[PDB]
Symmetry: D4
């Protein structure tokens, strides 16, 4: 019953479509280029060649049978803009659009895009964070000051316990998860040790985590 349409098969849009189909959902792959439709037809419940900037073709797809629509056109600003305008004028509930710059974001905001995504920009900032800090594998920001960070275990952390490396007192951070040799310990007891090259999931303020990385690692 729940229906997703993915217009603009690219890296972002193709990933969205393939992942939504893998999850067992109803997805329609839409693209103006025939080769992209041929490539993503195996990964969609239905795939059509449609110039989504044309109205008639959009109505022929039955764009109104879809609860969610994702305009993944991010390089052609005019195409994405007028596709989103068409979709909003056809009373589509949820419209998520890939953006290209701040001004494309402003245009999509003014025309009524329900969600605007900047994939390359967010990945750029995350990869820069992992770049300057070689210890960070991944993280998630709780706010402008707090976050949960996954770290690669260290020369200094090898064979040390959670009270030997106390963080709730020495840094104000909380030990959260340990990953060793494929196994994963959640909410670990104060007796658990950490070996080198393990995955340490910690949580707290960014500055305290950086201080732990500088002194405790």
């Amino acid at each position: 019953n729940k229906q997703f349409a993915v217009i603009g098969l690219g890296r972002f849009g193709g990933s969205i479509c393939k992942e939504l189909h893998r999850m067992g959902h109803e997805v329609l792959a839409v693209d103006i280029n025939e080769e992209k439709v041929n490539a993503y037809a195996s990964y969609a419940t239905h795939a059509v060649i449609a110039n989504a900037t044309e109205e008639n073709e959009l109505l022929s797809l039955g764009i109104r049978n879809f609860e969610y629509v994702i305009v993944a056109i991010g390089a052609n600003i005019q195409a994405s803009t007028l596709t989103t305008l068409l979709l909003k004028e056809l009373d589509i509930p949820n419209i998520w659009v890939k953006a290209q710059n701040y001004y494309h974001h402003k245009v999509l905001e003014k025309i009524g895009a329900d969600r605007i995504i900047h994939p390359e920009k967010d990945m750029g900032v995350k990869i820069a964070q992992s770049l300057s800090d070689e210890n960070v594998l991944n993280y998630i920001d709780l706010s402008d000051e707090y976050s949960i960070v996954e770290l690669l275990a260290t020369r200094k952390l090898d064979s040390k316990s959670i009270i030997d490396l106390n963080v709730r007192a020495k840094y104000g951070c909380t030990i959260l998860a340990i990953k060793h040799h494929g196994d994963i310990c959640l909410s670990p007891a104060p007796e658990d040790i950490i070996r080198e090259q393990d995955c340490l999931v910690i949580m707290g303020h960014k500055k305290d985590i950086k201080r732990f990385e500088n002194e405790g690692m």
Copy 2:
């Protein structure tokens, strides 16, 4: 600090350069497009116009002394491949490369790319997960089975204590954080309550977290 060289100022590479310079790192912005080098001039230490595939221009850039080199050319496969093979011939320790498809990733593997990144693919996976479940704001996967997940609160959770929603034994998860009205509570107590439209950071197995999303949300 450190020495980063961002070849190919795109959305991804430009975000990398801007974020790295915001954190005060020496970042060399390299591109072939004059307007691209003009766009990130104030957002980098040195912004030079140069063709990265030419060995003479790479020697002119002094690229052999940089510790970190990130090429962000994804659409142009030949340029990215030859630039990566060049930098590897110049014996660069850290080479991070943005890829476009599986075969580009494999050809970067064979020529010695240190870290290959697929930004749009991972972001599409994340946004598709957020699309299938509107409650999920952000998340991070500890493995192929356990994750830390951020949720948006529901009318079904307004003014309900943490002990009322026992997640340690009813589902085997752990509530981690409560963001409310711009403030944030880390590692809360069983007596703290939940209002609607709050940010709930939980941690546990994916299936158990979604079981909560079904039963209690």
Copy 3:
């Protein structure tokens, strides 16, 4: 006098610029085409080569201080849209935009265009009205029902007085003006006569005016 800035010197925009400068107004002629800026140089106060979609060039033009800004780019939808959104971000009070189709008009509505113009459409309507009825030279519509209409005289009207063609009671209209042999009579008397190939300015309901065109012409 006033401050007008005509971005996009086209046929429409070039006519605007030429006419406004003929009446002695400070008009800034802005275009990307060097030959276009060279064409209207003597027909404007300042004629500058600049890309209107670039924010830096718009700041260089001092466009933030102008009271009236008219962008005449119709064919290029993306350039017109981003220029309009730019000028609105710069808080311009009066933004007049030339449009190309309905969706361009809507996207200009959503980004805050002050007045959207469709020159070719309205002129086509007028010329089609003049085509269906060869008697109509020009006209202006007071509403969707009443108009002031200019006619070319017919052999059926040579040397016939205004009282002979009673239009106030026979059709409910009013004869307004009589152009003859380069001279012009405004608000004529019932004793003035009509010769053929004269300009007859009448006013009234469209259906009644055409009823006259049928019966008396």
Copy 4:
């Protein structure tokens, strides 16, 4: 019986065709681009894909069954020129052609075009008139010195009568129409009042109308 052919479907030509069809006439939409024919087929009694610069195709349309022919090609000077030459050499009674510049007008004049239209230029001068004079909504020029002008009612005109604002004596102009809240009074008696934001249709010399606008408004 009366037949119109509209060659050159653009903004101007498309408007002409759609308006002529709305009026209940026989129109044939001709265009070299298939998409334009597909778009305007719903708005024409018949629509064909024809390269109107080719003779054979023009004869195949039966261009001789048409009393009126409108060459709305205004960007390609050679195409419009040779289409008009073909049409005049095929003994078409009325040929109306959209022009682009003064020299295209001269060429069409020399080859025998029955009417030459400059839509963008006329709209440019009219919009410039409405630009410098913010009170003018629309107008119609009776001669180089006299015209009928429609104006937006003023702060000063609110709740004032036609003898309180005497124009036949104080300015030499004639009150002609009033439009208030959707209703429209024609040839109004001296007792009618005028409220703010009403539409005031006046008629007279341009200088007297401007003096009224300066002092009386």
Copy 5:
């Protein structure tokens, strides 16, 4: 001598310019192609780079004072037409124009071209006449019926006197000239003989000349 201006240095126009300068005439070689103006520089009095369709450049060339202006642009119809209409607006007495097809010839007729030339067409007619009859070297048509024709001699004419081949009464023609071994005899006598592979200039009706070509050759 005289003032010629060859606009559009092509094969035809370049030949005109080269031959006219060889005979010592002031010839202005005008073209848009820089290499074309460089090619005929030593073969003209003045060779200037200029766009002929621009009125300002034509005024810069001082083209209004030239007595003879020959535009040789044939492929580009619009450029040739506008250049011709320009030069006619500048009141040039002698305007010679190279045409490409019948409609280009007609549009040059209507805009006032003084002499329209079709070089390739006439040369094709001449070469086709020489192809149908290998005896014909060159010819000139006095009318649609009588011509002066040059023939190549045949074994059937070696050492035969002019009185032996009576052409004044047997066919009604006149033998005019005998070219033999680099020498040439004008208006020969009945006693002069003919050798093979000579140039025989005859004059008369086409049918009678070909009757000779059949019977005596």
Copy 6:
């Protein structure tokens, strides 16, 4: 039986083909562009779409059933060169080729072209001769020193006889033909007169003809 093939339908080639067909011959029109074949099919005994630079297509036309072949490709040097090489390697008796420059002539000479034609160049020199000498309508060169010239009769020649204007004694030229009001007198008697605007066909040395034009005209 006699067969002509015309490859390269242009102005020159199209004229050759149309004139050869008008003469009642067997012509095959060959062109790579489909529109040219469609245009010249009505003027050829057979017309085909063939890329004449391909061998297989040439053999499929039966290029060997043709005694004469005319490569009228004059703008593409490589196409004409390799078509002529193919034709000579297929043992075609007579190959006549349109040339473009002296070096193309040399190439066609070396590869074995039977005849090389420079139509535009010859017409250029002839039109230049008619340009500098406004009296010359047409002519034919007998040698480097002698020629027959057709002239427009003169103010001075009006109503004068052939002995009154003696040329065999005063100039060494021979009176040859007179054309008056459509009639044409050949080999005229010494009593024939010449009126103004008549056509005077004279024959002799170029210098004597020029002296006659200067003094006798």
Copy 7:
């Protein structure tokens, strides 16, 4: 049974395919351009139009029934690179690839190309050797110091024996073959003579051969 696939029909690849077919082998000609397939279909046991950079098409050809595969694409570096990567990932035993530069060679080496060929470069060095030494017809290098060289017999060598021109003692080289008037003597006895313009196949160190050429020739 033995199967060769030749992808990339060019001069090199076309020669490989035609020669392999002449030898009586099983060859499949693959090319993205239809005309190349049409040209080489007569010279291959099977020829198909296939975009070899696409996987699906490669599997459809049955690229796995081929023991040898030759990627003769040498101008498009990306196409050849990704075709070779596909072929190696499909477990093709022998992959021989035409290269373009040293860096393309390095890429093909890293991705696992079984053989890399530089045809133009090797022919360039061989033709340069024959250029500076006009006596060398062909040769074969045994090592960096020894080679067998074929030479054109000399003015000095005419009618001289193998002991009269002793090379095993005077130069350290070995006489190997003589070719005279089409006949060829192998391992010749000490009595054989050598005439001028014969072919002399000698073998030894490069320096001794050059000394023989300088003094003995």
Copy 8:
């Protein structure tokens, strides 16, 4: 030394230039591509940017004094042909030309090319011979029947003497050289043995050599 001029720096021509300069010859590297002239600057005596088809630039290069001129343009047939005809018109003694197909070779034959080379074709023949027989490393053909061939040794030949493999009488060939472990033995004795993975230089009839390859290898 000598004077070589390499026009058209390609893979073949660039290899020629590099090898000839390595051997210390005055080589003029001529190309139209600026980057190509910049690439071989250090690998030539003089590297000049020039269009070879322009006669003026060829005179500027002083090409008329060079003894050897090698044009390596193969893809561009017209440029190569006109350059060759130019250099032949300048009476160059030695003109070597790279060809692309048979007809290009013939047109170079007809215009007087001294030596025409087909590098890719001959290399394809050689590599196809090495493909049909993996034992063949290199070879040189003494005629259409006898060759000197280099083989890779087989397990079937390890530690077998030359007299054990009698090739003079069993097959009529002669073993010439044995390369082993970087050393090389010329004209070996019957007592020398053969190890596997050695280079065996043999000489004789092709059929007899392959008979050995079958029976003894």
